[PDB]
Design a protein around this ligand. Structure first.
Ligand SMILES: Nc1ncnc2c1ncn2[C@@H]1O[C@H](COP(=O)(O)OP(=O)(O)OP(O)(O)=S)[C@@H](O)[C@H]1O
Ligand SMILES: [Mg+2]
Ligand SMILES: [Zn+2]
Lengths: 287, 73, 250, 48, 68, 286, 76, 191, 49
């Protein structure tokens, strides 16, 4: 049996292949393989990911020639080192994460050879910048659903941590499959070299900024900042009046001075203090 | 078995509708494998458009079982 | 072969019909605000390999059920009503079959057969040809129309002038709209109304109620005929049983 | 409540008509005599 | 961390959103909408809304159908 | 010929994992692979890559191998699984610009006309951008050889994409310098880039190691720029460069003097907004 | 005589058969010895797919020959 | 079957350009390569046959592939012009067989030399003891014309099958333009 | 603010108009949609309705 503390380790490399292939053909359900490295009865490690040419419909998506599969794995053994189809994934476009009535069927084909084929959903729409609604699954027997017997024999307080969505609960969870808690394998091998490689620049700051127009832009804000302060020479004057909780609901048609009047003060500061300081270092450094 | 499965999914409740137009455009250009779909843009025959009394209009890429030459607008 | 037919059915019976849609405008390279003739409208995504540029306001699109995003787009559509209202008379009617109307023959001819080929003489004078005329008078009027129809093979369109009306809210006007649309589709084109009298009507003090949208579509056609469209290679042909009763402006 | 349209011999295949929803190629119930469902008539039909 | 939550707030602000027109509010952070559905419904708002820029062309959530 | 290159963080990452997969050789291996991408609008794009089997023996280091069947079929799969994708050139792991990369580019230019290379970093420490790319130009000229060919660096940056910006910003979850205000410029390029100019002053100090002792080729074409730098060293402080500098300090600070004057009044209006909620509740509530 | 087939996971199995056996026979045999029905029995040898009606003499597949199987992926 | 990988090294040197052998020197050794790649394929279907050269520019002309349609295409107007450089011919032969998909195959190389070589015998004996530490068996077959009694090649084969190697040979060239299908009947019959 | 994302997915309210109410604190109310009757939220007196 299982302990519902399965803890699927994935990587820091596979998920970018997951989302790029998932989003380049997003409204169709694209899918692929999971090529990883098995460990003990509890955990599993999926390290590499590749897709195949597919043929789809609106509600269904199939695969094509199987030759593609064996020839791809031969070339990945000879270059790098050999592995094994950890599992398989697919991509609900903007749905969420569940096993539909056809998604459950090819899972049933894959769980026969190895019983631990991990079924993975990636949604490349719901993922904005933070959360990436992934939620890997695996089947449970509908024979024990007939028995009314509750499976998986909870022997650790690590399963019931993440709560399922109600929309995935409308679907087959939890009558034919279960969820798995996952995290990410992170290391200085990779974590240091995506941070210190992505957002970097070279001259954007040792340079000046359109020197006749920066001082011109120091009037393009201040000119309407007069009349915006005239509204601030207006709105305080109608206080000691109708209970300023009313002055929250009422003022939603037009812009207030008070919040907008500290908005430009930050802008009229950092545009000046940066451009003044960066000019006064080139006097020292350059002769 | 195929005709039997058809009859299975050929249940007795049916949606009435009337013909609007029978579309015939080319397949798109150009298609690739990877995320291919044998359904969308792989030929020129044949498509059409219809409307149930409930005022809906869906695009058919696939004709279905019967032929359409017998049909018309 | 039979089993092949069967599997063509099988593999054919998994596609899904797709929501016919229309686009109002657009916000981003990816944000699109469209609306289906089902009714409502919703923000909707598209495919990154299908000419996100060619989607001008006015285009015709299709949407998937499941996720409601753009998958494919289709060219113009032509409301099969007018289609089957377009090309149904193969009459062998010939000028030989007719007689006693030579002067009328030529009169009609100039205003519908002359400019459709050569415009020179007119600009050489400097006068736009007319747009639409009609006769008035059992004298072979309808028959003569059917006869003259047999001289284009591309661009004759006839309408009975009464089936045009409908029972639903207002789409009768939409009909004439599509008509003039197809007119501008094939710039040489001949639309025809048979006894446009009944639909014609006149002025009233709102006696009835349907008279309201009747006159609505009426003034609709009024506008469509001679307002904000450079009438070019488009003749209207009408006839009556009493050329009194219609609107004076018409 | 439901309205008939027309039928065909040797096979049920009747045509129904309803108020707001569209029409459907339909079938009767065995539990009634197969006859008196001819055209120009009002009949009852389950919701589902 | 507030900023982290404040950026991740937009999970509602996904693509399949219905189109409507705003009508009126009666309180802070909550109001009633109007779409082509005509049927009107009284729903909340989110932080990211500038209350000040509100005959409001508004989009609404597909399933839950709230102000976005 | 080429404006610039655009690199995604995937192909940036898709070399590191292969550098891990051959890291068990221990002794010496450079990662060399096929770079895929689609250059459009005179801007070089880089999308996908893999790595080809490649070995090197130190004695007579002119013997390379590219298993082109592995290059034929896997690109044929990649041309299948993405027909938008094509070859864009190649790359190598690039610590220190190894010698075989003068004819690796000439070995496989029969696929890509402008077969561009990319030098990446596996042990990141710098103050710049640790992705480098060259281009192939050849010359029958100057002084060196009748057959002369030297690589020239076209500028390099890491392009982003709306799909992958979701991924990388979820994959960071680490120490960050967001909330760009008055301080982000102070540390992205005023703390940092001044020390960025260190390793470029010190870089030409490293070529300067040949005054009488270093390597035997002397100058010819290195000093025409160095003669220019002390020539294009900026103007001295005697002219109205003194006077017009005080002029703009006497203009830029006035805007700061107005803006700081506003900052005191706004928070004072906020002060009464707390004295309205202090005194008018102690009698009411208690 | 036996044969050999490897799944994408790297499995290694044999099947004592005779050259007059069809591929469908092997389909059933490893349906009993693997579980997957012949539906998703997409098998490859010599980089080629086999049809289930031809004898083993049609492919010259000898004993303990290194075939390769993948399922017939068709979810959605 | 038996695990090897047959790697042919063709001769596109400039001394092989005349017409002393009857059809062409090029086509006569070509069909000699054609029949041995039918002899290695049909005795073992796992062996692919690709060709390398040992000229001034050691090019991968055709990739190491089991198809010969690229081999049959390139060997017409192959331009056998160039200075021989055999001292790097050991390196372009050995490092090729480390790029193979299997290292459990037997490393078997044939080498066609039909030109006068200017190698150092002191350099190849350092390369031969290199092949002693690399455990490589190469049967060098001499074609064309050369220094008679293959100078430095008897000394290389002896320092190839030394240290319990005892299995490699040196098929020397007869200095007569006869039909070369009978000259290579000794490697195709046995080792 | 870290909870409305698990609050706003809730369906909104319903705008109704009452001609009048009656006993058992129930209310005949309209919607262009037909009328109905349900209870009142205990927090609402009906003389005020
Ligand atoms: N000038 C004519 N020469 C020969 N036959 C004619 C002539 N005029 C009418 N007919 C015959 O009468 C028929 C009537 O022609 P129509 O064009 O239908 O008449 P009409 O003048 O339009 O009358 P209405 O409007 O239907 S009452 C024709 O089809 C011919 O059979
Ligand atoms: Mg008539
Ligand atoms: Zn799915």
């Amino acid at each position: 049996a299982v302990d519902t503390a399965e803890q699927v380790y994935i990587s820091s490399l596979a998920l970018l292949k997951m989302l790029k292939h998932g989003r380049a053909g997003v409204p169709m359900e694209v899918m692929g393989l999971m090529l990883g490295e098995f460990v003990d009865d509890y955990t599993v490690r999926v390290i590499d990911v590749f897709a195949m040419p597919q043929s789809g419909t609106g509600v269904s998506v199939e695969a094509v020639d199987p030759v593609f599969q064996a020839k791809m794995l031969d070339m990945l053994k000879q270059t790098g080192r050999p592995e094994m189809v950890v599992g398989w994934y697919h991509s609900h476009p903007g749905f969420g994460c569940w096993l539909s009535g056809v998604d459950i069927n090819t899972q049933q084909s894959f769980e026969a050879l190895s019983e631990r084929a991990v079924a993975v959903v990636v949604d490349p729409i719901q993922s904005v910048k933070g959360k990436v609604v992934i939620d890997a699954f695996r089947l449970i027997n509908a024979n024990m659903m007939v028995l009314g017997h509750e499976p998986r024999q909870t022997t650790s307080n690590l399963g019931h941590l993440n709560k399922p969505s109600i929309q995935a609960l409308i679907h087959g969870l939890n009558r034919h499959y279960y969820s798995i808690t996952i995290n990410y394998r992170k290391n200085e091998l990779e974590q240091k070299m995506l941070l210190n490689l992505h957002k970097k620049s070279w001259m954007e700051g040792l340079t000046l900024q359109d020197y006749s127009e920066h001082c011109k832009h120091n009037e393009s804000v201040v000119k309407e900042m007069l009349e915006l302060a005239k509204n601030y020479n207006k709105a305080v004057e109608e206080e000691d009046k109708m209970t300023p909780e009313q002055l929250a609901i009422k003022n939603v048609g037009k812009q207030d001075p008070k919040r907008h009047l500290e908005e430009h003060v930050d802008v009229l500061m950092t545009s000046n203090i940066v451009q003044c300081l960066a000019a006064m270092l080139d006097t020292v450094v350059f002769k | 078995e195929n005709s039997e499965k058809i009859k299975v999914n050929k249940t007795l409740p049916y949606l009435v509708s009337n013909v609007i137009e029978l579309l015939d455009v080319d397949p798109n250009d150009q298609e690739e494998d990877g995320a291919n779909i044998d359904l969308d843009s792989q030929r020129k025959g044949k498509c059409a458009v219809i409307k149930t009394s409930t005022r809906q209009t869906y695009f058919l890429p696939v004709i279905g079982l019967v032929d359409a030459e017998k049909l018309k607008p | 072969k039979q089993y092949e037919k069967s599997e063509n059915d099988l593999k054919a019976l998994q596609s899904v019909g797709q929501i016919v849609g229309e686009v109002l405008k657009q916000l981003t390279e990816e944000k699109f605000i469209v609306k289906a003739t089902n009714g409502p409208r919703y923000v909707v995504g598209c495919r990154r390999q299908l000419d996100k540029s060619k989607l001008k306001p006015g285009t015709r699109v299709a949407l998937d059920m499941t996720t409601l995003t753009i998958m494919r787009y289709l060219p113009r559509e032509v409301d099969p009503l007018v289609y089957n209202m377009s090309h149904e008379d193969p009459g062998n009617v010939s000028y030989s079959e007719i007689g006693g109307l030579s002067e009328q023959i030529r009169e009609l001819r100039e205003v519908i057969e002359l400019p459709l080929t050569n415009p020179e003489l007119f600009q050489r004078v400097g006068i736009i040809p007319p747009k639409g005329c009609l006769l008035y008078g059992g004298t072979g009027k309808t028959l003569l129309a059917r006869a003259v129809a047999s001289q284009l093979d591309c661009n004759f369109l006839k309408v009975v002038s009464s089936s045009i009306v409908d029972k639903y809210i207002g789409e009768s006007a939409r009909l004439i709209r599509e008509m003039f649309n197809y007119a501008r589709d094939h710039q040489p084109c001949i639309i025809f109304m048979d006894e446009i009298d009944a639909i014609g009507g006149r002025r009233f003090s709102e006696g009835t109620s349907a008279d309201r949208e009747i006159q609505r579509t009426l003034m609709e056609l009024l506008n469509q005929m001679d307002g904000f469209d450079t009438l070019h290679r488009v003749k209207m042909i009408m006839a009556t049983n009493r050329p009194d009763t219609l609107d004076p402006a018409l | 409540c439901t309205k008939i349209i027309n039928a065909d011999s040797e096979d049920p295949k009747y045509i129904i008509n309803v108020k707001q929803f569209a029409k459907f190629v339909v079938d009767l119930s065995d539990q009634v005599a197969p006859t008196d469902i001819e055209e120009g008539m009002r009949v009852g039909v389950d919701r589902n | 961390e507030f900023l982290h939550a404040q950026e991740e707030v937009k999970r509602i602000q996904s693509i399949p959103l219905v189109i409507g027109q705003f009508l009126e509010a009666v309180d802070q952070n909550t109001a009633i909408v109007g779409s082509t559905t005509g049927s009107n419904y009284y729903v909340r708002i989110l932080s990211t809304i500038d209350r000040e820029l509100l005959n409001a062309s508004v989009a609404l959530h597909k399933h839950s159908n709230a102000l976005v | 010929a080429v404006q610039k290159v655009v690199v995604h963080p995937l192909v940036l990452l898709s070399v590191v994992d292969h550098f891990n997969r051959i890291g068990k050789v221990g002794n010496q291996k450079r990662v060399v692979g096929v770079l895929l991408g689609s250059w459009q609008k005179k801007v070089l794009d880089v999308s996908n890559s893999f790595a080809v089997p490649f070995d090197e023996d130190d004695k007579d280091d002119s013997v390379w191998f590219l298993d082109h069947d592995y290059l034929e079929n896997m690109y044929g799969m990649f041309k299948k699984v993405n027909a938008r994708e094509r070859i864009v050139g190649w790359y190598h792991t690039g610590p220190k610009l190894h010698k075989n990369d003068i004819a690796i580019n000439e070995l496989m230019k029969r696929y890509c006309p402008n077969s561009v290379l990319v030098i990446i970093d596996v042990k990141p420490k710098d103050l710049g951008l640790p992705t480098e790319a060259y281009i192939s130009v050849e010359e029958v000229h100057d002084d060196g050889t009748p057959t002369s060919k030297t690589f020239e660096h076209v500028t390099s940056e890491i392009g982003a994409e709306e799909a992958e910006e979701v991924g990388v910003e979820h994959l960071l979850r680490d120490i960050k310098d967001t909330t760009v205000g008055t301080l982000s410029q102070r540390i992205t390029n005023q703390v940092h880039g001044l020390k960025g100019l260190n390793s470029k002053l010190l870089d030409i100090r490293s070529y300067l190691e040949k005054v009488a002792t270093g390597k035997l080729p002397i100058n010819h074409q290195i000093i025409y720029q160095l003669q220019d730098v002390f020539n294009l060293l900026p103007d001295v402080s005697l002219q109205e460069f003194v006077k017009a500098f005080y002029l703009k300090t006497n203009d830029q600070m006035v805007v700061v003097y107005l803006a700081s004057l506003i900052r005191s009044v706004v928070a004072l209006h906020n002060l009464i907004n707390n004295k309205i909620a202090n005194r008018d509740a102690e009698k009411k509530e208690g | 005589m036996q044969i050999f087939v490897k799944t994408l996971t790297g499995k290694t199995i044999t099947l004592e058969v005779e050259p007059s056996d069809t591929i469908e026979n092997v389909k059933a045999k490893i349906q009993d010895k693997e579980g997957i029905p012949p539906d998703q029995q997409r098998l490859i040898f010599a980089g080629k797919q086999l049809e289930d009606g031809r004898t083993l003499s049609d492919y010259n597949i000898q004993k303990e020959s290194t075939l390769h199987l993948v399922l017939r992926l068709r979810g959605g | 079957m038996v695990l090897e990988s047959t790697m042919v090294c063709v001769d596109n040197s400039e001394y092989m350009r005349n017409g002393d052998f009857l059809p062409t020197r090029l086509q006569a050794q070509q069909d000699a390569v054609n029949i041995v790649c039918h002899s290695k394929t049909r005795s073992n279907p796992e062996n692919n046959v690709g060709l390398i050269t040992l000229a001034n520019d050691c090019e991968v002309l055709t990739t190491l592939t089991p198809d010969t349609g690229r081999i049959l295409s390139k060997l017409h107007t192959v331009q056998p012009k160039g200075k021989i450089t055999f001292c790097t011919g050991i390196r372009v032969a050995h490092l090729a067989l480390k790029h193979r998909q299997g290292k459990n195959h037997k490393m078997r190389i044939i080498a066609f030399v039909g030109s006068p070589v200017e190698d150092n015998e002191k350099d190849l004996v350092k390369l031969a003891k290199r092949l002693k530490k690399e455990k490589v068996n190469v049967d060098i077959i001499n074609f064309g014309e050369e220094e008679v009694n293959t100078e430095k090649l008897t000394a290389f084969v002896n320092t190839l099958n030394g240290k319990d190697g005892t299995g490699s040979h040196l098929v020397t060239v007869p200095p007569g333009p006869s039909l070369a299908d009978a000259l290579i009947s000794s490697p195709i019959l046995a080792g | 603010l870290r909870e409305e994302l698990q609050l706003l997915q809730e369906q909104g309210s319903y705008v109704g108009e009452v001609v009048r109410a009656m006993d058992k604190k129930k209310v005949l109310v309209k919607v262009p949609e037909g009328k109905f009757v349900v209870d009142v939220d205990k927090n609402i007196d009906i003389n005020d309705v």
